[PDB]
Design a protein around this ligand. Structure first.
Ligand SMILES: CO[C@H]1O[C@H](CO)[C@@H](O)[C@H](O[C@H]2O[C@H](CO)[C@@H](O)[C@H](O)[C@@H]2O)[C@@H]1O
Lengths: 13, 279
């Protein structure tokens, strides 16, 4: 790919 | 006749070789992409200009090195352009002063992609340039061989368009929520441009990227991108229209999206590629 997007997230109780 | 780099590394009378370490700032131009301008990096002078005139050419066989070897381009030598790697000796530059003067060489790469790039690791050889020096006095015929090295990690663009960043990391709010993705693109001249997303998806609609977090992963949620409030499926061309020298935002936003089943606590991560295409 030309650009790599890393998406970070979290699910909390 | 002798030469030196901006950092003081010299090749003496009779020629030889030297390494040139350059902080690269490659860029797309109209019809060709600048790799490196060496007129600020390599300097030469005539040691006896009162009685001798020195003649300096770029010799055939000058070429890219390392990961630029598969690409062709052009070299600008003293205001004129020639195919690179060089297949014939260039016209000469006259050196007629003891004062150091630039060696007027700049290297360009022929565009072959839309917005692609080649990653260069710092310390990598990027070109080998052969300077030939003769004179109007005797039969001297010397070579000054310049091994050009990248001083910094850099991406050389291979297309007509370039991006604000080659890697973008965003952090979402804790589920639920969204976050904008900062990403723009521009082109050296007007291009009819689009892009598509790539990555592993969870749904039949091919629009929710899977959670690939390795450590303590959440279950039941993935990542979905939107543009203008509209879901963007993977492997589908988004049209940006005509894109010129003014940067255009892709308008991307990241979201969570449920993929099925229970939503359990944990980490979420999706790796999504963007690839541009001429339309
Ligand atoms: C007066 O210059 C001649 O005598 C010098 C001493 O023997 C040589 O160094 C000199 O040759 C070097 O300088 C000239 C002028 O830059 C250059 O044409 C030659 O290739 C050497 O670099 C010259 O023979």
């Amino acid at each position: 790919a030309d650009v790599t997007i890393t998406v970070n997230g979290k699910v909390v109780a | 006749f002798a030469c030196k780099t901006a950092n003081g590394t010299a090749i003496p009378i009779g020629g030889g070789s030297a390494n040139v370490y350059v902080n690269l700032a490659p860029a797309v131009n109209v019809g060709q992409n600048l790799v490196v301008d060496l007129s600020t990096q390599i300097f030469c002078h005539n040691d006896y200009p009162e009685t001798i005139t020195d003649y300096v050419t770029l010799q055939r066989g000058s070429a890219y090195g390392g990961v630029l070897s598969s690409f062709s381009g052009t070299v600008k030598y003293n205001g004129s352009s020639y195919p690179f790697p060089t297949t014939s000796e260039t016209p000469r530059v006259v050196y007629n002063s003891r004062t150091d003067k630039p060696w007027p060489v700049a290297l360009y790469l022929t565009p072959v992609s839309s917005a692609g790039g080649v990653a260069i690791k710092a310390g990598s050889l990027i070109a080998v340039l052969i300077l030939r020096q003769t004179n109007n006095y005797n039969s001297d015929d010397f070579q000054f061989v310049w091994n050009i090295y990248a001083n910094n990690d850099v991406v050389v663009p291979t297309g007509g368009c370039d991006v604000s960043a080659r890697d973008v990391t965003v952090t979402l709010p804790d589920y639920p929520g969204s976050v904008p993705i900062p990403l723009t693109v521009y082109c050296a001249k007007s291009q009819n441009l689009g892009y598509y997303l790539s990555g592993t998806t969870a749904d039949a609609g091919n629009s929710i990227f899977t959670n690939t977090a390795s450590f303590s992963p959440a279950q039941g949620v993935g990542v979905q991108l939107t543009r203008n409030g509209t879901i963007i499926p993977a492997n589908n061309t988004v049209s940006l229209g005509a894109v010129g020298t003014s940067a255009v935002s892709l308008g991307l936003t990241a979201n969570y999206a449920r993929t099925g089943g229970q939503v359990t606590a944990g980490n979420v991560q999706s790796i999504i590629g963007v690839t541009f295409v001429y339309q």
